[PDB]
Amino acid sequence: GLFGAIAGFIENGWEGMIDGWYGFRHQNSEGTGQAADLKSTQAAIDQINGKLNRVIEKTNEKFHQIEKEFSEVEGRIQDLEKYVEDTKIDLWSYNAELLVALENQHTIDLTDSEMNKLFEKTGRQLRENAEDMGNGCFKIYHKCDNACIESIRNGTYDHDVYRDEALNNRFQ
Amino acid sequence: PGATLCLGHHAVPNGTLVKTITDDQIEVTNATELVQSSSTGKICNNPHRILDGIDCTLIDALLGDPHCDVFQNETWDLFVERSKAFSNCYPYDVPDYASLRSLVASSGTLEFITEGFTWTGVTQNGGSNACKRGPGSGFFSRLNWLTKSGSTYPVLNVTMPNNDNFDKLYIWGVHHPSTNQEQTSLYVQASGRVTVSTRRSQQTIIPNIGSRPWVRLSSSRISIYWTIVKPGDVLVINSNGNLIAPRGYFKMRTGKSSIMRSDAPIDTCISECITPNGSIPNDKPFQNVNKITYGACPKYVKQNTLKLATGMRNVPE
Ligand SMILES: *[C@@H]1O[C@H](CO)[C@@H](O[C@@H]2O[C@H](CO)[C@@H](O[C@@H]3O[C@H](CO)[C@@H](O)[C@H](O)[C@@H]3O)[C@H](O)[C@H]2NC(C)=O)[C@H](O)[C@H]1NC(C)=O
Ligand SMILES: *[C@@H]1O[C@H](CO)[C@@H](O[C@@H]2O[C@H](CO)[C@@H](O)[C@H](O)[C@H]2NC(C)=O)[C@H](O)[C@H]1NC(C)=O
Numbered sequence A: 001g002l003f004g005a006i007a008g009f010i011e012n013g014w015e016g017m018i019d020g021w022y023g024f025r026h027q028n029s030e031g032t033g034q035a036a037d038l039k040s041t042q043a044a045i046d047q048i049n050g051k052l053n054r055v056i057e058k059t060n061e062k063f064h065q066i067e068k069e070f071s072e073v074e075g076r077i078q079d080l081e082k083y084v085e086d087t088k089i090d091l092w093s094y095n096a097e098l099l100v101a102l103e104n105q106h107t108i109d110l111t112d113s114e115m116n117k118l119f120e121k122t123g124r125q126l127r128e129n130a131e132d133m134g135n136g137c138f139k140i141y142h143k144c145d146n147a148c149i150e151s152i153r154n155g156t157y158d159h160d161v162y163r164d165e166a167l168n169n170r171f172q
Numbered sequence B: 001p002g003a004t005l006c007l008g009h010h011a012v013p014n015g016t017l018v019k020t021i022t023d024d025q026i027e028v029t030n031a032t033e034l035v036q037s038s039s040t041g042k043i044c045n046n047p048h049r050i051l052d053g054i055d056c057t058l059i060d061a062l063l064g065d066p067h068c069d070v071f072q073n074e075t076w077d078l079f080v081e082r083s084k085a086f087s088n089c090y091p092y093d094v095p096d097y098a099s100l101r102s103l104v105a106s107s108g109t110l111e112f113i114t115e116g117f118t119w120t121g122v123t124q125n126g127g128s129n130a131c132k133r134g135p136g137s138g139f140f141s142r143l144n145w146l147t148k149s150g151s152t153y154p155v156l157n158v159t160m161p162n163n164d165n166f167d168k169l170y171i172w173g174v175h176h177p178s179t180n181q182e183q184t185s186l187y188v189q190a191s192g193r194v195t196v197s198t199r200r201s202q203q204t205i206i207p208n209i210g211s212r213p214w215v216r217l218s219s220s221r222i223s224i225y226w227t228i229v230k231p232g233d234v235l236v237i238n239s240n241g242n243l244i245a246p247r248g249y250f251k252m253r254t255g256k257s258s259i260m261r262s263d264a265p266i267d268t269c270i271s272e273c274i275t276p277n278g279s280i281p282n283d284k285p286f287q288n289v290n291k292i293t294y295g296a297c298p299k300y301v302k303q304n305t306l307k308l309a310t311g312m313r314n315v316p317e
């Protein structure tokens, strides 16, 4: 996509993550673990539901119309009836083709955007206590137990608490 | 000493292919189908009033071919003509058949009001072995075949005013005998004439004597015409022979009625959208079942499938 997260600096997706669309894997002293982020997941889903529901808004009801199949050859009037319907079908077919192409291009870009936004938000929580390894992982330069990890994931992590500890580890 | 926090996104083993502006195939986690491409093969009996013509065309039910008498005064939202339909009365044609069929289909009713026409000096209720009704000879129920009384057919000249607040549709015709003997034998005059008029319009038809192909016992034909008479206007019928007279008028409506050719059976379900192939659901915005539709329907497109992505790009190991 336009943001270079999905199929970009994040090498691949996780078939393992079944509880959401975006999230976190960690390794600390206490081992490994995985958890989905709800806000990012929900923002993508809401956007996709929105377009889905706009696209499937029922908006066509027609009753008496022109004839479209004919049992006899007639000439001019029939040629025009067929041409009118053929013109209409080609225009609607074009509309349907373009609609999905545009929508799908946008769906890919917005999901890529959400990945990237979560990554930048996380980097901003961590301030000077971590560094971007270049592959969608942050190297955290301090003791970060499962209470500390949970605090990053839920938006409460206070960077001052660990700044001294981590500034030391970064420049030594 | 330190920790790692890795950001990622989900993926699935079972991806779906979609098109974009740049790629004609790319795998996403999920997608939904926007083209309805199938039907159960049945026309749902609700919520639209469906009238199955069975063996009868709409025109034959209008005119009143005896095997179509069950359709007298019928109404419909959608009239269904079957390919097995057949005529079994006097052989006829309708100049501009398609237009009469259309206007009647669209009116949505065969409500017929008999009026007290006076046909002075002629024999009424003519019939033919071509149009059996019970065991004996007969005719179209809504038409009145006039012939000589004794040895004369006088100039008929009648009026019927529209004092109602709706439009009246009159169906009438002209008989085209196969020989001069037949002509004179039925109408006395060597050449007939029918003039039907209102204040606004006039039609004059001259019959044409000659053989046509033998169909259901007859080389002769009837040609069917129609006249609409608006509130406050008047019908005048003038003929010195060959008039197939109206018995009254059909009541005209405007509304959402139509007609469809189909051999699909009618069954018990609910569907807003009807095609000749059967009813189809209308949750999707497009359909590839049939360009002919009635009701709240997806729009017909040429593609049999169009997938809308409902998830991100699927990137597995
Ligand atoms: C055949 O039938 C038609 C319809 O009944 C006849 O038309 C009528 O002809 C008379 C004249 O003989 C018209 O009379 C005029 O009526 C107006 C009323 O507005 C009056 O002001 C005049 O002084 C005059 O009396 C009559 O209006 C007309 N009827 C209609 C409905 O227009 C026709 O005369 C008949 N023809 C034959 C040859 O029998
Ligand atoms: C709906 O019915 C029509 C026929 O009444 C089907 O259309 C035909 O399809 C084949 C190609 O698969 C062609 O040989 C015919 O010429 C088509 N007819 C017309 C008028 O286009 C159609 O396949 C049916 N669709 C479904 C889903 O049942």
Ligand SMILES: *[C@@H]1O[C@H](CO)[C@@H](O)[C@H](O)[C@H]1NC(C)=O
Binding pocket: B030, B031, B032, B033, B310
């Ligand atoms: C994905 O789409 C299909 C139908 O197109 C739907 O039935 C299914 O529930 C959806 N699954 C998810 C996980 O969104």
Ligand SMILES: *[C@@H]1O[C@H](CO)[C@@H](O)[C@H](O)[C@H]1NC(C)=O
Binding pocket: B072, B073, B111, B112, B113
């Ligand atoms: C048709 O409708 C009219 C009233 O609108 C009625 O007088 C007439 O008898 C009906 N005919 C039949 C055959 O049901």
